[PDB]
């Protein structure tokens, strides 16, 4: 069944005004609250 | 088809030791094989 | 909808004037390509 | 527990069971995780008869969620003319501002609910009211490009 969800609205004009990119906004919100797979590393000889 | 009386052995790193510890293990197995010239002959690594 | 695409803010002028997408373009639902045009006994038609 | 069954009854549009919970004295201002009362849910899912029953049993009409939004905010956004009129009859703050400064008129203007916009103005809406960005219901109608609405807001 449907559940409450936190609808955030990015104001384009206000962002364009302050000189903040939308790419940086979305990456910040998405990476922080959602998680972001950056690249691979080696843990005891295995790619992870 | 290779040759007859010839064998193909694979030494495996099963516990994330590393390349150096596996080399030491190979070197240790090769040295032991060399003390049985009556059973084994030409026991050598295939790699570099 | 076409209304939401119409109100896409492209830039903001120094006098606080919003240059929207509908101010520099006509917004409408239209075919991906306009190459194929079919007619059934002369009248407008489509098909598979 | 009983206040929880009221939230699920007010949302699931069960008129009969919502009234049974009143006989048993269910908390009418029973707020969920997000701070929504039964009135919030009925205004949202468009349950008019549940809204009326609730307000009768002393529902707080100016109840606000964890983001400052009232039932009137939800009625005016989802275009529930009747429900909007009931809340305004029962003394809803027509100039109610949420955390972002968005009013019930702001939301009516955005979704282009001309009939509701007229009810709010009738009841004493402030057209010059601003959100946190300094945009009015008139500013909205121009950007959205609504002519019928913009002439009403003048």
Task: Give a three-class secondary structure readout of chain C.
Answer: CHHHHHCCEEEECCCCCEEECCCCCCCCCCCCCCCCCEEECCEEECCC
**Residue A37 Cα, gap to closest chain C Cα (Å):** 31
Residue D133: closest CA among chain A residues belongs to which residue? A14
Q: Which residues pair with C43 in a beta bridge?
A: C40
DSSP three-state, residue B10: coil
Q: End-to-end alpha-carbon separation of chain C, Å?
A: 27
User: In angstroms, rounded to a whole number, what is the distance separating the alpha carbons of residues D131 and D137?
Assistant: 10
- Residues in chain B within 8 Å Cβ distance of A46: 16
**Helix ranges restricted to H, B1-48:** 19-33
Residue of B15, B16, B17 for testing the chain A interface, max A β-carbons within 10 Å: B16
**Number of Cβ within a 10 Å radius of residue D112:** 17
Tracing tokens 């609250």 back to the chain, one arrives at A33
User: In angstroms, rounded to a whole number, what is the distance separating the alpha carbons of residues C18 and C8?
Assistant: 10
Do at least 3 CB pairs under 8 Å connect A with B?
yes
Phi, psi values for residue D117, rounded to 5°: -50, -40
With an 8 Å Cβ cutoff, the interface of chain A facing chain D consists of 4, 11, 13-14
User: In angstroms, rounded to a whole number, what is the distance separating the alpha carbons of residues A2 and D147?
Assistant: 35
Give the 3-state secondary structure of A1-48: CCCCCCCCCCCHHHHHHHCCCHHHHHHHHHHHHHCCCCCCCEECCEEC
Tracing tokens 């929207």 back to the chain, one arrives at C20
- Report how far apart, in Å, the C-alpha atoms of A32 and of each of A25, A26, D68 are: 11, 10, 25
In chain D, how many H helices and how many E strands? Answer: 10, 0
- Is D36 at the interface with chain A, CB within 8 A? yes
User: In angstroms, rounded to a whole number, what is the distance separating the alpha carbons of residues D44 and D61?
Assistant: 14
CATH classification of D1-154 is 2.60.40.10, yes or no?
A: no
User: In angstroms, rounded to a whole number, what is the distance separating the alpha carbons of residues C40 and D33?
Assistant: 59
**Number of Cβ within a 10 Å radius of residue D38:** 32
Query: Which two three-digit tokens encode residue A18?
Result: 């302050």
Tracing tokens 């797979």 back to the chain, one arrives at A37
Q: Are D138 and D107 in contact (CB under 8 A)?
A: no
Q: Are D137 and D126 in contact (CB under 8 A)?
A: no
Query: Which two three-digit tokens encode residue D12?
Result: 């699931």
User: In angstroms, rounded to a whole number, what is the distance separating the alpha carbons of residues D21 and D132?
Assistant: 40
D27: enclosing H helix or E strand: none
């Amino acid at each position: 069944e449907d559940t409450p969800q936190f609808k955030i609205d990015i104001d384009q004009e206000k962002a364009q005004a302050l000189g903040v990119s939308i790419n940086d906004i979305n990456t910040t919100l998405g990476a922080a609250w959602g998680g972001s797979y950056v690249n691979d590393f080696i843990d005891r000889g295995r790619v992870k | 088809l290779g040759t007859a009386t010839g064998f193909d052995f694979e030494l495996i790193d099963q516990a994330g030791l590393g390349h150096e510890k596996l080399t030491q293990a190979r070197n240790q197995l090769l040295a032991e094989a060399a003390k049985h010239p009556d059973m084994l002959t030409s026991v050598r690594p295939n790699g570099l | 909808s076409t209304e939401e695409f119409g109100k896409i803010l492209l830039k903001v002028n120094q006098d606080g004037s919003r240059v929207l997408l509908r101010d520099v373009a006509k917004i409408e639902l239209g075919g991906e390509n306009y190459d194929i045009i079919a007619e059934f006994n002369g009248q407008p038609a489509s098909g598979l | 527990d009983l206040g929880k069954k009221l939230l699920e009854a007010a949302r699931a549009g069960r008129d009969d069971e919502v009234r049974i919970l009143m006989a048993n004295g269910a908390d009418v201002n029973a707020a969920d995780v997000v701070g929504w009362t039964p009135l919030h849910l009925a205004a949202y899912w468009g349950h008019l008869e549940i809204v009326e029953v609730l307000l009768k049993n002393g529902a707080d009409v100016n109840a606000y969620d964890t983001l400052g939004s009232t039932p009137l905010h939800l009625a005016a956004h989802f275009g529930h003319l009747e429900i909007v009129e009931v809340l305004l009859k029962n003394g809803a703050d027509v100039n109610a501002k949420d955390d972002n400064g968005i009013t019930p008129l702001h939301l009516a203007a955005n979704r282009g609910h001309l009939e509701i916009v007229e009810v709010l103005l009738k009841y004493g809406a402030d057209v010059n009211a601003q959100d946190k960005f300094g945009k009015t219901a008139f500013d909205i109608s121009i950007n959205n490009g609504n002519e019928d609405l913009a002439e009403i807001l003048q």
